[PDB]
Amino acid sequence: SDELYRQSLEIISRYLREQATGAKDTKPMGRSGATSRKALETLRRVGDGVQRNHETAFQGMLRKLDIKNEDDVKSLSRVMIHVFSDGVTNWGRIVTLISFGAFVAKHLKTINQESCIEPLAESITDVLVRTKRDWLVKQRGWDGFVEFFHV
Amino acid sequence: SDELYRQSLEIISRYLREQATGAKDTKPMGRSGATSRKALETLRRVGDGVQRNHETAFQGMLRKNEDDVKSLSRVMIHVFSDGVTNWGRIVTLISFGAFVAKHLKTINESCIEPLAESITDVLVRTKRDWLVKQRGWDGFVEFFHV
């Protein structure tokens, strides 16, 4: 029973699969579906923006990770943990994480490997919920996230 | 970070340790150590009781080796999800984990810590919100007061 992990995995998996397939998973949202939806919109705008402002960096990182199969998607946990846990915990870091997640998912759809898009998301979630939990709790979670990127 | 995971891991690992070796880790606890110590004392009491009452079933469960310590995860998750979510089941998990730790303290101490990490992982993941409720280990000690 980890609501934070549940909603996080929902939003993240939805965004990473939507960024790849190009289609919107119109399936009904779970609990706090309003927050999840708004979070998905925020991630759409801000996330795509980040993917456009850091194309070179994401491309080079993807080239360096060399993700060709599911075992690689399993192994990238350590490096992800190392690079992400820079100690500096800001929402821009999170959005960067999920956006590169989406980039990687796109590549994983380019290569015949949509089968790896779902576990990847989990890994991402598994990091964000473990490394920066108490922080996320203190920032009112996704409710803060949305409220942070309001224009 | 995850203070719940940290404190839980400390308490669990230290109980499994003290039970497996007989010695104590005199090194002071981390944050909210006042609660962690009492949690360890409580765990000593009711936990040793639980073991001393469920020895047989415990002896049966271990029948089904550093390569399998990362494998007990699944069956532990399944069996833990079985039954109602009460403090007694958590105490059961920790006590049994302590006995399993004893087994490793006899057949070979190298596999105790990853076991503690597994226990803590299952507990704090499956019963996260229930544990952030009950004020955590504070409520754990409040449950078995006196």
Curated annotation (Swiss-Prot), chain A:
It is found in: Membrane; Cytoplasm; Mitochondrion; Nucleus, Nucleoplasm. Induction: Expression increases early during phorbol ester-induced differentiation along the monocyte/macrophage pathway in myeloid leukemia cell line ML-1. Rapidly up-regulated by CSF2 in ML-1 cells. Up-regulated by heat shock-induced differentiation. Expression increases early during retinoic acid-induced differentiation. Cleaved by CASP3 during apoptosis. Coiled coil: none annotated. A motif (BH2) lies at residues 134-149. Changing residue 38 to R: No effect on ubiquitination. Changing residue 27 to R: Reduced ubiquitination. A motif (BH1) lies at residues 82-102. A motif (BH3) lies at residues 39-53. There is a cross-link at residues 24, 27 (Glycyl lysine isopeptide (Lys-Gly) (interchain with G-Cter in ubiquitin)). Signal peptide: none annotated. Interacts with HIF3A (via C-terminus domain). Interacts with BAD, BOK, BIK and BMF. Interacts with PMAIP1. Interacts with BBC3. Isoform 1 interacts with BAX, BAK1 and TPT1. Heterodimer of isoform 1 and isoform 2. Homodimers of isoform 1 or isoform 2 are not detected. Isoform 2 does not interact with pro-apoptotic BCL2-related proteins. Interacts with RTL10/BOP. Interacts with BCL2L11; may sequester BCL2L11 to prevent its pro-apoptotic activity. Interacts with GIMAP5 and HSPA8/HSC70; the interaction between HSPA8 and MCL1 is impaired in the absence of GIMAP5. This is Induced myeloid leukemia cell differentiation protein Mcl-1. The chain holds residues 172 to 321 of 350 of the full protein.
